[PDB]
Amino acid sequence: MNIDLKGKVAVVSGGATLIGKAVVQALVSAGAHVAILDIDAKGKAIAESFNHDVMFIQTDLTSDAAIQQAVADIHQHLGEVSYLVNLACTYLDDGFKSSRQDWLQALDINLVSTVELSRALYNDLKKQQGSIVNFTSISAKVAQTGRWLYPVSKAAIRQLTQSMAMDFAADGIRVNSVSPGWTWSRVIAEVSGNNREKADSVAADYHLLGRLGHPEEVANVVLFLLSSAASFVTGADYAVDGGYSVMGPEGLQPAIPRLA
Amino acid sequence: MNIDLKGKVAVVSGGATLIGKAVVQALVSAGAHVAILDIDAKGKAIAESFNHDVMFIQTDLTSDAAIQQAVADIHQHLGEVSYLVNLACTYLDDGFKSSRQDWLQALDINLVSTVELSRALYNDLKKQQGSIVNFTSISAKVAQTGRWLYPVSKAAIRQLTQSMAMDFAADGIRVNSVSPGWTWSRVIAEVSGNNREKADSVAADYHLLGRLGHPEEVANVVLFLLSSAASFVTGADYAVDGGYSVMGPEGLQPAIPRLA
Amino acid sequence: MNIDLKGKVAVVSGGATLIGKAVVQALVSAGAHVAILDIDAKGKAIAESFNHDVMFIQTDLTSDAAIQQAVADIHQHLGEVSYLVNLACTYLDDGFKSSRQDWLQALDINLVSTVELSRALYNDLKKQQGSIVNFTSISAKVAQTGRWLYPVSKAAIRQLTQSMAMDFAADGIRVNSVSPGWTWSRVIAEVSGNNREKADSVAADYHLLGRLGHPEEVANVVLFLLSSAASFVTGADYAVDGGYSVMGPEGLQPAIPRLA
Amino acid sequence: MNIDLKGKVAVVSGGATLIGKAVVQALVSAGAHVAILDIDAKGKAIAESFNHDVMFIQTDLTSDAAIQQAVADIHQHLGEVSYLVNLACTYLDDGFKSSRQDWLQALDINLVSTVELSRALYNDLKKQQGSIVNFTSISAKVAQTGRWLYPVSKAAIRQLTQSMAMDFAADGIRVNSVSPGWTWSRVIAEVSGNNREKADSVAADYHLLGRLGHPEEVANVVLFLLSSAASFVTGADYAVDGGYSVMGPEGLQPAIPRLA
Structure with a gap:
């Protein structure tokens, strides 16, 4: 990523x-x-x-x-x-x-x-x-x-990204959104006792890649979308969530067997 | 609908x-x-x-x-x-x-x-x-x-509908949303000259069913969701838009031939 | 529903x-x-x-x-x-x-x-x-x-519903899709030992309404969409899943506290 | 993109x-x-x-x-x-x-x-x-x-991408999808008379950025997803469609004024 x-x-x-x-x-x-x-x-x-x-x-x-x-x-x-x-x-x-x-x-x-x-x-x-x-x-x-205020705010940001993209395109401005999952945080670092392996194992239940995301991994997507390599990307939502958003309430574990 | x-x-x-x-x-x-x-x-x-x-x-x-x-x-x-x-x-x-x-x-x-x-x-x-x-x-x-404020507000209502459904389910309250397209309205009646067939002619380009929706057609979906027939429906968005939302910028007319 | x-x-x-x-x-x-x-x-x-x-x-x-x-x-x-x-x-x-x-x-x-x-x-x-x-x-x-074949098949059915809606509208035919969650089944009835309360408690983890859906609850949505009350509904996906699809891998239980 | x-x-x-x-x-x-x-x-x-x-x-x-x-x-x-x-x-x-x-x-x-x-x-x-x-x-x-077969096939590829991501994550394999819009192609070059500005003029109605995409602009997104910069990206769909997918049948032109 140079x-x-x-x-x-x-x-x-x-x-x-x-x-x-x-x-x-x-x-x-x-x-x-x-x-x-x-x-x-x-x-x-x-x-x-x-x-x-x-x-x-x-x-x-x-x-x-x-x-x-x-x-x-x-x-x-x-x-x-x-x-x-x-x-x-x-x-x-x-x-x-x-x-x-x-x-x-x-x-x-x-x-x-x-x-x-x-x-x-x-x-x-x-x-x-x-x-x-x-x-x-x-x-x-x-x-x-x-959690109501932040999820609703972020859904609204998503729509705003689309509308900005449409009404800014005429001026040659591209507008996109980045959708991360659980990323290593200051708050998580303090509640976990600065214990990353345990926080990762907790997050494994909600991310296919089995850990929290690194801030750097999110930053890569930000930089790509800003750069001219993304010159035909506008109004899009680029997920950087390690697979969180492909899952539903069943997670990544089998659910049918629990019925027996 | 009785x-x-x-x-x-x-x-x-x-x-x-x-x-x-x-x-x-x-x-x-x-x-x-x-x-x-x-x-x-x-x-x-x-x-x-x-x-x-x-x-x-x-x-x-x-x-x-x-x-x-x-x-x-x-x-x-x-x-x-x-x-x-x-x-x-x-x-x-x-x-x-x-x-x-x-x-x-x-x-x-x-x-x-x-x-x-x-x-x-x-x-x-x-x-x-x-x-x-x-x-x-x-x-x-x-x-x-x-148009920013109303599209963004409605995008936010969609997420609020989901979070309301989740946090209200424990109390037995269902929460859903209705998504209509262009429906006959007072404002359309004023700009149309109270001409419904003309407004339908305009809206045909954006609705598969070739007209504006009737207020009653929206009310039918509202009533269904309120009733006990929708007793396993919560957190859903029920579209009553005459096919608007299945289309993109190409509408319902072929676009490839235009390239020739 | 008469x-x-x-x-x-x-x-x-x-x-x-x-x-x-x-x-x-x-x-x-x-x-x-x-x-x-x-x-x-x-x-x-x-x-x-x-x-x-x-x-x-x-x-x-x-x-x-x-x-x-x-x-x-x-x-x-x-x-x-x-x-x-x-x-x-x-x-x-x-x-x-x-x-x-x-x-x-x-x-x-x-x-x-x-x-x-x-x-x-x-x-x-x-x-x-x-x-x-x-x-x-x-x-x-x-x-x-x-599970690959059935999920991919059903995603394809969703797109097919849209395309049928578009290309059938001219003939006055409406085409929609119904998206249920876990519904009481013959298979579930046999693996559960015809025990509904236990199967419901298993399903509660994936449905806001805390049980499996009843076949009748799905049939209500089918009949609505077929009827003339849905006369402005075409190409739409009507969820009858008790809130399954509003949830992600965290389900309906808190996830932040697990980090501590 | 180095x-x-x-x-x-x-x-x-x-x-x-x-x-x-x-x-x-x-x-x-x-x-x-x-x-x-x-x-x-x-x-x-x-x-x-x-x-x-x-x-x-x-x-x-x-x-x-x-x-x-x-x-x-x-x-x-x-x-x-x-x-x-x-x-x-x-x-x-x-x-x-x-x-x-x-x-x-x-x-x-x-x-x-x-x-x-x-x-x-x-x-x-x-x-x-x-x-x-x-x-x-x-x-x-x-x-x-x-158009049915190709749209449905691609809708199926989207779900297959998600299910592949889930069942491949355990082995450390990431799986994503790329969604392009109208991109310069051999077929477009043949119907266009190898006239790129004319084909761009047609495509402007369906892309916020006012032209067809370049093959290289799609390749940039493919390369990003293959690289280790996308190391927390799995199961995602990355759009490179110049704003196509944010629009509906109204396109990027106002539609309400038409009613008057």
């Missing part, structure tokens, strides 16, 4: 997550400069890890003013933007117990802000004929007990 | 539309008492045509207080609710031009308010072990130029 | 299964005469159960001559056919171990014969402006370990 | 097509040795252009003996196979007019032969822990007037 994006500029929302850092590293390795927009402070450290190749801009994407200031800063330090990766999300989700206020907050962060960040960067993507990668999940294709 | 729902109480949000009127008539004909919730005053007239069997309650479903008051009125005049048909929606939609405020408004009306209305009625549906029908669209499965 | 199909004639392939008998009973109750086409001899008993309302014609649907003779017999004893329910299938399936010969046999029985039986009845369905119901499964939407 | 597959051996059925040629070139450029299996003699010329790195073996994949001999020749000249690209297909397709014999022939070539070729190569892919790429189409997700 793609060449020398001189290009990329924007990565929610770049403080392990997937976010893998996406940033993938872009830097390809020669691109990256601006990380996130509310989490840890992002700063990530940016410093790449010295002048990556810049961190703490941004509340629900604030239009914060987005305008972030794009101004990107223009001042890096230049015109070619790639946008919308990875920002909130895990505010208590199913039926979540309130109307929680619903609107989660939708604003997970969905509406993707529109506003794309809009603030649209003229750049138009001039550069760039590409956009949004993030769905296996949760956008299936129901999970007790 | 189902018996004698004595059962149904609530139909967005009941002032042609679809809503057809659903109300289908329910009354089946012996049910109906509460019409809508922000449109036309609903009043509709209810009056059915004398004491149908009630109208002008409701802004974005107001929690309005929902509590609507449920109180239903309790006073009709009683415990068995069926909920979430048909309320807004067509506030300017594609990419729609603002953040427009996004959150359309999501509040189309999606979050469905949750709040379901929550206010949940104890009724649990005691009665009733059923819920949400409304998706052909717009939740495909992209349409210049 | 539909009126007086005087109509229906053909039910594979009518010897419990689902088949439920579909036949549903049609008879609606006033229709039914011809059961099947290779299984038990069908004869089923037909006798309805005296002169149902006729049995032992038919090898892989034999074109047998199909022509069956349609001749239907015309001699019953008349012009209005409804066709393609329920015939084989469970010849050993996954990767199944041979090319097994593959072609299973595809011939499960798929190609549906085309030939529709073709032999096409002029009837055209004159009567009838409807067709094919049978998919939850197996057409997901992968199941060790 | 992947390193040095020393690895790939097999490409149906390699005489433009897609196949692009995939062969992509693999060779990545350092792989390629075996071209096809019934078309044009493949011979293709292989000769790459001297000793690419081999051509004229094969009727419906003949088990031919497959065994093709694997023997691959073993003699190149060695153990790591990658399999199932691209062989027939366009024998007359919709409803196609006979039972035509159905079984098209299914044998398009679908069952994929299984037999995978089975003959399975021990290789298991030892090498390789990957398989099947070919679906935009025709597996939608209905097209007058």
Whole structure:
């Protein structure tokens, strides 16, 4: 996976997550400069890890003013933007117990802000004929007990990816979505006691490949879809879930014999 | 379609539309008492045509207080609710031009308010072990130029229908969705000049059956899903789109010959 | 579910299964005469159960001559056919171990014969402006370990339903598919020891409604789609699986806590 | 797209097509040795252009003996196979007019032969822990007037891809599918008069990106899925259709205005 994006500029929302850092590293390795927009402070450290190749801009994407200031800063330090990766999300989700206020907050962060960040960067993507990668999940294709806000948000992101693709094609912008499964996480790392083999064995029940996915494995699909190798891919959902979404409630274990 | 729902109480949000009127008539004909919730005053007239069997309650479903008051009125005049048909929606939609405020408004009306209305009625549906029908669209499965808010809202309703089904099954409540295509509507009647054969001529290009759907044809599917005949149907999306969703950009006309 | 199909004639392939008998009973109750086409001899008993309302014609649907003779017999004893329910299938399936010969046999029985039986009845369905119901499964939407021939066959039936819908619409014929989950079966009845409560508790892990489906519950959806209440439903897949298809490998039980 | 597959051996059925040629070139450029299996003699010329790195073996994949001999020749000249690209297909397709014999022939070539070729190569892919790429189409997700056999065959390939992924995961073999839209082809070049801009003008109505796809653009996705960058991708369908599959019968042009 030796793609060449020398001189290009990329924007990565929610770049403080392990997937976010893998996406940033993938872009830097390809020669691109990256601006990380996130509310989490840890992002700063990530940016410093790449010295002048990556810049961190703490941004509340629900604030239009914060987005305008972030794009101004990107223009001042890096230049015109070619790639946008919308990875920002909130895990505010208590199913039926979540309130109307929680619903609107989660939708604003997970969905509406993707529109506003794309809009603030649209003229750049138009001039550069760039590409956009949004993030769905296996949760956008299936129901999970007790989780409403994030699955519904991600299903909505899927449709938004299609509509953006259609209405952005005229300007030469490609828009796709990436649908991962269980990926090694900071949260999983802490609840598991930083024990990867056990977390993998738990995940084996829901992934044909028998483990959690690596952030790098997700980042590869992001970079492919951004690159010109995917020049005839727009509006598509690229699954990187180790086979999660081909299975139903029976999993990968026989079910008929239980009847006897 | 001669189902018996004698004595059962149904609530139909967005009941002032042609679809809503057809659903109300289908329910009354089946012996049910109906509460019409809508922000449109036309609903009043509709209810009056059915004398004491149908009630109208002008409701802004974005107001929690309005929902509590609507449920109180239903309790006073009709009683415990068995069926909920979430048909309320807004067509506030300017594609990419729609603002953040427009996004959150359309999501509040189309999606979050469905949750709040379901929550206010949940104890009724649990005691009665009733059923819920949400409304998706052909717009939740495909992209349409210049339309973002309503397609995305309906794509979100589809996932919400699945997650509602899962977390409500334990209480014996079924939840499904209905996906109609182009159906005869007030707006189409106004742009058509109240010319149905002309509008049918336009819609033939997008429906295998060569016309717009009738509101009653949609109401039939709604009624089936509410009834006990659908007693093993939960979390499903039932299309009533005259073949719209089986087609792609080629429509129903051959396309290869055009290359010669 | 009191539909009126007086005087109509229906053909039910594979009518010897419990689902088949439920579909036949549903049609008879609606006033229709039914011809059961099947290779299984038990069908004869089923037909006798309805005296002169149902006729049995032992038919090898892989034999074109047998199909022509069956349609001749239907015309001699019953008349012009209005409804066709393609329920015939084989469970010849050993996954990767199944041979090319097994593959072609299973595809011939499960798929190609549906085309030939529709073709032999096409002029009837055209004159009567009838409807067709094919049978998919939850197996057409997901992968199941060790089962290739039947899932692939059913996925192919799904696409065939769409293509038939498109190319039959001009003649006023509607074509849909029904997708059930685990339904109480003869095979399940024998391996379970005719113990329904235990089989239901096994199935609860894969159906939100916590049991196997009843054949009658599937038959209701078949009859709806055949009837004129579904007059704007063509090319659609109507799930009657108690919520099986809304779930993934996590089932309906929490999965995050296992990580701790 | 600078992947390193040095020393690895790939097999490409149906390699005489433009897609196949692009995939062969992509693999060779990545350092792989390629075996071209096809019934078309044009493949011979293709292989000769790459001297000793690419081999051509004229094969009727419906003949088990031919497959065994093709694997023997691959073993003699190149060695153990790591990658399999199932691209062989027939366009024998007359919709409803196609006979039972035509159905079984098209299914044998398009679908069952994929299984037999995978089975003959399975021990290789298991030892090498390789990957398989099947070919679906935009025709597996939608209905097209007058075309049954190929759309249904491809819909079946989609499910076969999922079931292969599941039952091959234990052996470390990934299996995915690629779904292209209208791609430049020999047949289009013949009906077009070798006029690419004209054919692009026709295809713009069915692809957001306003043209036919290039064979190389499809080959890029094939190569990504074969490579270790897709190491958490199994059982997925990767669309490379220029936005075809996000559209319905309305295409990318507004349709509501037509009603006025």
